[PDB]
Amino acid sequence: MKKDTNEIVQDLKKILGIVSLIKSANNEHQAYKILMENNSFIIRTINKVLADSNYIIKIIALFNTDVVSDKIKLEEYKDVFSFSKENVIFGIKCFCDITIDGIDQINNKYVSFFKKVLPNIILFQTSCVKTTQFVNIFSKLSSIVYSEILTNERLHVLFSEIMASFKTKVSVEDLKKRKVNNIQGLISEISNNREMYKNIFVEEYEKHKTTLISIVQCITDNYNINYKENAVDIEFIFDFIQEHYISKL
Ligand SMILES: CCCCCC/C=C/CCCCCCCCCC(=O)O[C@H](COC(=O)CCCCCCCCCCCCCCC)COP(=O)(O)OC[C@@H](O)CO
Ligand SMILES: CCCCCCCC/C=C/CCCCCCCC(=O)O[C@H](COC(=O)CCCCCCCCCCCCCCC)COP(=O)(O)OCCN
Ligand SMILES: CCCCCCCC/C=C/CCCCCCCC(=O)O[C@H](COC(=O)CCCCCCCCCCCCCCC)COP(=O)(O)OCCN
Ligand SMILES: CCCCCCCC/C=C/CCCCCCCC(=O)O[C@H](COC(=O)CCCCCCCCCCCCCCC)COP(=O)(O)OCCN
Ligand SMILES: CCCCCCCC/C=C\CCCCCCCC(=O)O[C@H](COC(=O)CCCCCCCCCCCCCCC)COP(=O)(O)OCCN
């Protein structure tokens, strides 16, 4: 699967390329043109990701070259991280039970873009969830995520402190001089320095957990985001992903 992990780096380059075209675009109508000119790529990729029950394990394999050299590891990874067509269906159904009464509906050209692709996402049609609802939740959520990452001040503070602490453990100047600036260089740096970057991640996460949970919980509260007409428990979600997913890497 050296070509399939090649597939993922090739897809991420084209994705980041779409992104840099949208960021540096003069207005919405230009970004909407940019998304439509990539219309078949975005729909093919979603469909291709969702039908590849091993896609997550192929992402792990970019970062652990030592996994491809051991089918026991790979298969103990497929036990945790492989998802089926019905897992995808189940996850879409669960997605539409999120309510965000905290902000009006979004209708810009991204939302109109979003509704043009969904009748071609095969497994989304299979779910028989109403497009109006799914679009509404997805557009409200991604509007919140992007707005909070750009505008939330506690998040900016926290990002700054993790950034500074990072710089005291890794020489970013010497990384830039060894040309670890691109996506491939960055992938290779992490995969060859696995144990360290993962310990850096764990330690920064543990040091800053209370802030991070608090910030995200205050976001879900301040937009009244519910799951099954109930408050969302960020702490429980984060501890959950930790015990069943992150810890098994
Ligand atoms: C811009 C693109 C970025 C997107 C990419 C997404 C990447 C996600 C994860 C990538 C890397 C994750 C961490 C890698 C570390 C792997 C090892 C590991 O994390 O497993 C172990 C679990 O512990 C631990 O802290 C685990 C640390 C806990 C982390 C909890 C994560 C919670 C995040 C929740 C986000 C969910 C989103 C939904 C929002 C509601 C830690 O390592 P070990 O040496 O076994 O032991 C040391 C400790 O266990 C104590 O003994
Ligand atoms: C560069 C990034 C490196 C990331 C490293 C991985 C970190 C992972 C942390 C994120 C959260 C973990 C997600 C685990 C999802 C897999 C679990 C799953 O199978 O879903 C099952 C339930 O399904 C659901 O509810 C939702 C499933 C949807 C997952 C599929 C989503 C596709 C993922 C593709 C990611 C995007 C790729 C883009 C990159 C170019 C679990 O049920 P089970 O009882 O455990 O089934 C047992 C039978 N196997
Ligand atoms: C693996 C399973 C997961 C796949 C799920 C498929 C979803 C992929 C579909 C992507 C199509 C885009 C969907 C529209 C999202 C609507 C977000 C939204 O509400 O718009 C705004 C959110 O902000 C933005 O998104 C601004 C635009 C920046 C980039 C937007 C789109 C990124 C393009 C990604 C291209 C890659 C697609 C390929 C995926 C495989 C609302 O914010 P605002 O403050 O009102 O103003 C923004 C001013 N720039
Ligand atoms: C970087 C981009 C961030 C995107 C964040 C929003 C994406 C939404 C989907 C993300 C995956 C959600 C992970 C679900 C896995 C948790 C599985 C689980 O434990 O089951 C359930 C966990 O509860 C849920 O499923 C919540 C449903 C997902 C909604 C989470 C979205 C919250 C919004 C956060 C946005 C904050 C933005 C922060 C910006 C950095 C327990 O539910 P229960 O059975 O009714 O019992 C209640 C027990 N307390
Ligand atoms: C960037 C490169 C890729 C990085 C990989 C990260 C991608 C993962 C993020 C999205 C995938 C969702 C992550 C959580 C995985 C689900 C956790 C899980 O184990 O499954 C179940 C999930 O828990 C839930 O009840 C639902 C939680 C909310 C799921 C909604 C958000 C994810 C689904 C979105 C589907 C995306 C595909 C749609 C594409 C258009 C456990 O449910 P259960 O009630 O306990 O009963 C079933 C078995 N007990």
Curated annotation (Swiss-Prot):
Lineage: superkingdom: Viruses
Cell location: Virion
The keyword Glycoprotein appears for this protein: no
Keyword presence, Lipid metabolism: no
Family per similarity comment: Belongs to the chordopoxvirinae A6 family.
Function: Plays an essential role in immature virion (IV) to mature virion (MV) transition.
Name this protein carries in UniProt: Protein A6 homolog
Phylogenetic placement of the source organism: Viruses, Varidnaviria, Bamfordvirae, Nucleocytoviricota, Pokkesviricetes
Shown part of the complete sequence: 126 to 374 of 374
